[PDB]
């Protein structure tokens, strides 16, 4: 297979700015390779072709370049639609392989996540699970580390996270970590801490709440 | 003006064959051109399966050879896609797609929408809905409350707040698999004096069990 491999594998850039995009492919691919853009959810969208040709309907601040194994994308003065996914794909040989793919964030200054510990409600309990949810909202940039201890004592199994995509308001993100236990290791133990790290605060921010208190 | 549609049942059992079928309108797909299927894996990942050209040649991707069928219908302007033996590595996206097209001045590539297609033996499991009140802590002048949706199948699930008049800082996060069933969670963020005096109900609705569930968020 031929391997075609992308970087950046993303990228923190502000409308207005420059970007360029690389791939490059394990052998000389002689310019057969486009560039495909994915959206939000969504679909997708051919930029351009053999190398440098762009395709019917793709705005001029597009533009592709290379040779031989070393092609780029270009997109000069970003707009708010240019925020998504790329990829390049080599068609020159079966199977038509593709690059990891490159995303455009959209860079804001920094902001600290608002941590929220839920302990497991009344109707979980009556069947027997105990799910403790955290949730760690807003938050820039998207590095966040979040430890569950149980009593002082870090808890890896049962954790299960989620992130969202960048909030198009904010442009924050925001990070779900459930701890789904039994009833029976539940009632064991007293002290519940959900701990982010991020570099906003020189000190975690610990979240946490007994399983006595109300 | 050509326009690609996938089409096809959206869940398949272990060990059968996912069929899909991509209706093509604006072009004939025996006159010029390969018609390609391809899907995206969940993690972006891309991966090339197969095309018929307009000849009725097909070519697919070595890996795919001995499981993969690539056929049209003329007559309705149709090719489809068959993976036999469908394990659960095949859950993705599929998306029937064109060559290089020469229609306009430039060339043009044509993208259907892409259906999302699981390969698990659960049956439709509906969700077990609990409201997440604050649990006896500061607090500001801003709550957080949530609901959690655990143990469903299949995917989706629709999530929102009353009844939707609640749009604000909401925040319905994705899916996870466990033990093979799904769970998610949304929050909402209201100032403090509305709750509870101002009601914060939970709306989960499953589609494939039918079913309505409306969890309303009460102080503990
Ligand atoms: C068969 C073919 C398939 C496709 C591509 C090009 C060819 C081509 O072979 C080049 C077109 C031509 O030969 O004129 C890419 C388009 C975006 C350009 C797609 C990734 C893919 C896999 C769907």
């Known amino acids: 297979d031929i391997e075609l491999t992308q970087s950046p594998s993303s990228m923190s850039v502000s409308l207005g700015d420059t970007v360029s995009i690389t791939c490059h492919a394990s052998?000389?691919?002689?310019?057969?390779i486009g560039w495909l853009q994915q959206k939000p959810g969504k679909s997708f969208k051919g930029l351009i072709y053999?190398?440098?040709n762009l395709e019917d309907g793709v705005p001029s601040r597009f533009s592709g370049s290379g040779s031989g194994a070393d092609y780029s994308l270009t997109i000069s003065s970003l707009e708010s639609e240019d925020f998504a996914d790329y990829y390049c794909?080599?068609?020159?040989?079966?199977?038509?392989?593709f690059g990891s793919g490159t995303k455009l964030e959209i860079k804001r200054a920094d902001a600290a996540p608002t941590v929220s510990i839920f302990p497991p409600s009344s109707e979980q309990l009556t069947s027997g699970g105990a799910s403790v949810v955290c949730f760690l909202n807003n938050f820039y940039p998207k590095d966040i580390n979040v430890k569950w201890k149980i009593d002082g004592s870090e808890r890896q199994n049962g954790v299960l996270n989620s992130w969202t995509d960048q909030d198009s308001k904010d442009s924050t993100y925001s990070m779900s970590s459930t701890l789904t236990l039994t009833k029976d290791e539940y009632e064991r133990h007293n002290s519940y801490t959900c701990e982010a790290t991020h570099k906003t605060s020189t000190s975690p921010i610990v979240k946490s709440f007994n399983r006595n208190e109300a | 003006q050509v326009q690609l549609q996938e089409s096809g049942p959206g869940l398949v059992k272990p060990s059968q064959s996912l069929s899909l079928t991509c209706t093509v309108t604006?072009?004939?797909?025996?006159?010029?051109?390969?018609w390609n299927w391809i899907r995206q894996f969940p993690g972006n990942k891309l991966e090339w399966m197969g095309y018929?050209?307009?000849?009725?040649?097909?070519s697919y991707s070595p890996s795919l050879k001995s499981r993969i069928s690539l056929t049209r219908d003329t007559s309705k302007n149709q090719f489809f896609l068959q993976l036999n033996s469908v394990t659960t590595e095949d859950t993705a996206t599929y998306y029937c797609?064109?060559?290089?097209?020469?229609?306009?001045?430039?060339?043009?590539?044509?993208w259907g929408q892409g259906t999302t297609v699981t390969v698990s033996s659960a049956s439709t499991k509906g969700p077990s809905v609990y409201p997440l009140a604050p649990g006896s802590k500061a607090a500001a002048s801003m709550v957080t409350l949530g609901c959690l949706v655990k143990g469903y199948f299949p995917e989706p699930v629709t999530v929102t707040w009353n009844s939707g008049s609640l749009s604000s800082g909401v925040h319905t996060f994705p899916a996870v698999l466990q033990s093979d069933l799904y769970t998610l969670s949304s929050s909402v963020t209201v100032p403090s004096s509305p709750r509870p005096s101002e009601t914060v109900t939970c709306n989960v609705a499953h589609p494939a069990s039918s079913t309505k569930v409306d969890k309303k968020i009460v102080p503990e």
């Open positions: 797609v064109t060559s290089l097209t020469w229609l306009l001045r430039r060339k043009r590539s044509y």
């Open positions: 604006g072009y004939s797909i025996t006159s010029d051109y390969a």
């Open positions: 018929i050209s307009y000849s009725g040649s097909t």
């Open positions: 052998q000389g691919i002689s310019s057969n």
């Open positions: 053999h190398g440098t």
């Open positions: 794909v080599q068609y020159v040989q079966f199977p038509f392989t």
